[PDB]
Amino acid sequence: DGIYAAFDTLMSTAGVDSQIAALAASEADAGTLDAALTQSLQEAQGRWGLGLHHLRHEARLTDDGDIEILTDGRPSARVSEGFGALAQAYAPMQALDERGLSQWAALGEGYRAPGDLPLAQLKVLIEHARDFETDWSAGRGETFQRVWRKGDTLFVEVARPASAEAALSKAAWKVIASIKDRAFQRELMRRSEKDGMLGALLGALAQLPEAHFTVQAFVQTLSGAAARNAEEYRAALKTAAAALEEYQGVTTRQLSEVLR
Amino acid sequence: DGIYAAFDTLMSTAGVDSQIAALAASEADAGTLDAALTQSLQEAQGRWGLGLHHLRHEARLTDDGDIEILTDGRPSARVSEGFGALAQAYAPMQALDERGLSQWAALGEGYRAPGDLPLAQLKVLIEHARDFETDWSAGRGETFQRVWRKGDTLFVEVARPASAEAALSKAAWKVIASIKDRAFQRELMRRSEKDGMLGALLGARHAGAKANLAQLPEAHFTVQAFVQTLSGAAARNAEEYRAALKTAAAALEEYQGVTTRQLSEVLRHGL
Amino acid sequence: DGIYAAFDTLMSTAGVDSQIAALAASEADAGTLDAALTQSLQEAQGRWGLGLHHLRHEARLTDDGDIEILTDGRPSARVSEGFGALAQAYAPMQALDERGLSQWAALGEGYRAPGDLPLAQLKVLIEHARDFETDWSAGRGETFQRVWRKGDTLFVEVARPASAEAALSKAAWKVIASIKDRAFQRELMRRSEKDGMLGALLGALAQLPEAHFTVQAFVQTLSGAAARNAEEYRAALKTAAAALEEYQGVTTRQLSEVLR
Amino acid sequence: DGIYAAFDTLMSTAGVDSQIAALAASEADAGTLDAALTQSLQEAQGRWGLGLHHLRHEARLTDDGDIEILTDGRPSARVSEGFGALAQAYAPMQALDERGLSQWAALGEGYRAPGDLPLAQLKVLIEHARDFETDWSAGRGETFQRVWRKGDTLFVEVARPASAEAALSKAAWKVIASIKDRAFQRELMRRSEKDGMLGALLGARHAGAKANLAQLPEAHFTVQAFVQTLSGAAARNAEEYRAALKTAAAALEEYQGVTTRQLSEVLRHGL
């Protein structure tokens, strides 16, 4: 179950407990496995902060027993090629500004409401518009928020962009601070002075998916009448911010564990 | 030659100067004539007030020298069948409330906002929503309004519902008030108290006038609405929206007055 | 009990639980308090790694209710003048090399055995010499060791020199890594990038005794026949190394607590 | 003049050429004479083998023209009191074992290493210890050794214990073996079998010879030891230590042989 386990780690870098290997162990058929893979990939895309909401992300089993990742049904990458390869495949499809926020609109071509829109106007849009989308707006705790509705589903995205290097540095900091051996810790803190906690931990990388994917956002979804309710929108925004916090903490602790 | 003038008179009831007869006489190719017929009939559909904005309306020439009208690619009627036949074709696809307003949405399936939305909320929708539609207003008399945007075009519809019979009755009231023979007009009013003003007028017309009046398109079609369209940046302008609402209201009033005058001059010249 | 509490913190920087304020609260007389102060000062001198074993360190109550610190009976400093003042008073009496080890001999003038002495020769000196002293020798875990006998007491000193700046940096590292608030921690780690964890913690010093005194050594003492036994010497060396480790850990955790 | 020569003869029993009489005749000031007396007597104390290294030995002139000997600043005897009186003064401060070796330590209170310490351990002590002392060796016959360092000076003491009576007995054996009168020597041996060889010799001496022999310092003092001293770097040299041990042993042998010859030439010249 090598490819299944690799997909499991790829999902775990986004805080997704896909359990794909366990599902394959239960003699699940190709369709059920593909549906689970696609659901996990969509969940992880909602958290990676790549800004590809305009594309349909799917994952399927191939004839040779591999897992293929596709965008809009177009073959994008395969797991056997490595996680860095899949990041390289995703890169040209992205468009990021200096803040790490996606410049693409989730609804594609069409009007986009300004990010500095007053809350009363946003309430009007929520209650009475058909489809709408807002640009990135500043939020609490150095985060950014936006919202868009497609059909009968309202998506609220809260993002704090973060490079993989920063998360690796934070995890290495925590790991170095948590070392029980005094002399070993003093040596690592000494090497850190010269090569960062990066070369401190490594001296004591691309294969690990955490070097390419880290949690940067979270998308919460409302459906039905809840999609047209301001109370539900605010509740979803709060839950999305809390989920971003929780999943970033989970991923940083997981990275610390894997570096230990 | 006759069918083209018949189409022209059908369009004239909706205020459309199609000039199809002139285009036919100019020996224009088929595609141009079908395009002109389709554009004229689509223009007239927004004025007849049938509430069929969700259907695609087309008109094309057929092999046997007639004009065929189609909705959603499905044939509906031929012009030679008569105007009442066209009305009977359009009727089962209508859904009107007690006020004479269409209950169908212009955008089809989807959310429609309530009517009488405050200027602030409607302004937010106009400036920042992608596509939207509102229900009919409460009314300012027998005049109602609604607005919907599709893609890059905003449509403001102002409708004063009126059947062809209602317009003919208004014209009949006008001509009876215009009659200088006081005894004759008093007699006509005495018969009207029993048989309706329209029926009283028709009873004093020529022999077989009812059969000679069903041949006119105005007995089945009349102006019930006016749609004013904005495009581009003006489609997202609340000021342009309210100005277009006023423009459509004034245009509807002018058109209905013109139909009233024409129907009065027809009923008086009858007998 | 301000001066008593200040002396208590001064002893706590060496890991000494002097409890001087509690003793003064029990209406202890001047002699008992002075004896306790002198014992605590000697214990702290054994751990500060200042290399002043050749001097007699005493502490006494003054007529005005202060505490006076003396070397060889000569007034050296007073607690009311501050801990930095006492460090300044101790500084000219010191002699330290590039490794942070004291160059002074604990027995004063006289012969000093080389630090690279073979262990059999050291055993002979332990069993049959009257008084002896060895220079600093390298030991396990980046530590250094030396031994000397005066009269009927054998002292084994194990030292890992460490500046107060390094201990402060290590404590700030631990405190930053232990912060429960994610955004606050990210801000501190960001400021650290520019001003060290020093300005990171301070921006969110000389008055605190930890800025001037930190644990650098430990001295274990044997008496009687145990002073002339090689087994006892090796056991004392092991206990001294373990005590150095334990007290350095205790002081670093205490400094982390006081910076939190 | 007599007391100075008496001190000289007292020193001669320990191999010290004090020349106090010449210094007195040279009219040297008091301080010089006291210093010379003290140095000579301290030199003789290390050869008499009384084991009083822990005491400070001094000699000084007094008001009445005599010489007073002091230990630790306490007066002990005057030279005019006789040499036996000086021996009786020194005796209660001694502590000798059955071998004639002093049980007192040279460094006083403190640790003393066992004797017969292997060359390696003793070498470590010599090179790296500050101050140390060892007990007496097992002996190589009646000759014993020990070593102690104080400050910058190392002392190696080699002792062959012998009372003045023992040295006189050895000299008596020598002179009796030297006697050419075979009948006389056989008679002396016959009396010696009963009264000791020394007593047999003294019985054949002059009248009142025992009273005429107590006036000689050699009846109470004799060479029992030799101390060789190293200073400075040589005080921390094991090779210098062993060389000094050999030097002290040879010097002790030479000194005791000289005393034996002198005592024999005195006993023979007696009668």
From Swiss-Prot, chains A, C:
**Membrane-spanning intervals of the chain:** none
Answer whether the UniProt record assigns the keyword Phosphoprotein to this protein. yes
Post-translation changes:
Phosphorylated by RqkA in vitro. Phosphorylated primarily at Thr-62, and to a little extent at Ser-102 and Thr-134.
Please give the residue positions where the record annotates the modification Phosphothreonine.
Answer: 62, 134
Provide the induction entry: Induced to high levels following extreme ionizing radiation exposure. Also highly induced in response to desiccation stress.
Recite the UniProt keywords alphabetically. DNA damage, DNA repair, DNA-binding, Phosphoprotein, Stress response
UniProt key word DNA damage? yes
Query: What's the domain of life for this entry?
Result: Bacteria
GO biological-process terms attached to the record: cellular response to desiccation; cellular response to gamma radiation; DNA repair; double-strand break repair via nonhomologous end joining
Upon gene disruption, the observed phenotype is: Cells lacking this gene show a reduced growth rate, do not exhibit a decrease in the efficiency of natural transformation, but are much more sensitive to ionizing radiation than the wild-type strain.
Which residue pairs form cystines in this protein?
Answer: none
- Which first-to-last residue range defines the signal peptide? none
GO molecular function list: damaged DNA binding; double-stranded DNA binding
Control of this protein's activity = Phosphorylation increases DNA binding affinity.
Q: How is it used?
A: The PprA protein combined with an immunofluorescence technique can be used to visualize radiation-induced DNA strand breaks in mammalian cultured cells, allowing the evaluation of DNA damage responses. This detection method could also be applicable to genotoxic tests in the environmental and pharmaceutical fields.
Positions carrying Phosphoserine: 102
- Known role: dsDNA-binding protein that contributes to the ionizing radiation resistance of D.radiodurans. Plays a role in DNA repair and genome reconstitution, and is necessary for recovery from severe genomic fragmentation as a result of exposure to severe levels of ionizing radiation. In vitro, binds to double-stranded DNA carrying strand breaks and stimulates the DNA end-joining reaction catalyzed by DNA ligases. Thus, PprA plays a critical role in a non-homologous end-joining (NHEJ) pathway for the repair of radiation-induced DNA double-strands breaks.
* Protein's recorded name: DNA repair protein PprA
Q: Which organism is it from?
A: Deinococcus radiodurans (strain ATCC 13939 / DSM 20539 / JCM 16871 / CCUG 27074 / LMG 4051 / NBRC 15346 / NCIMB 9279 / VKM B-1422 / R1)
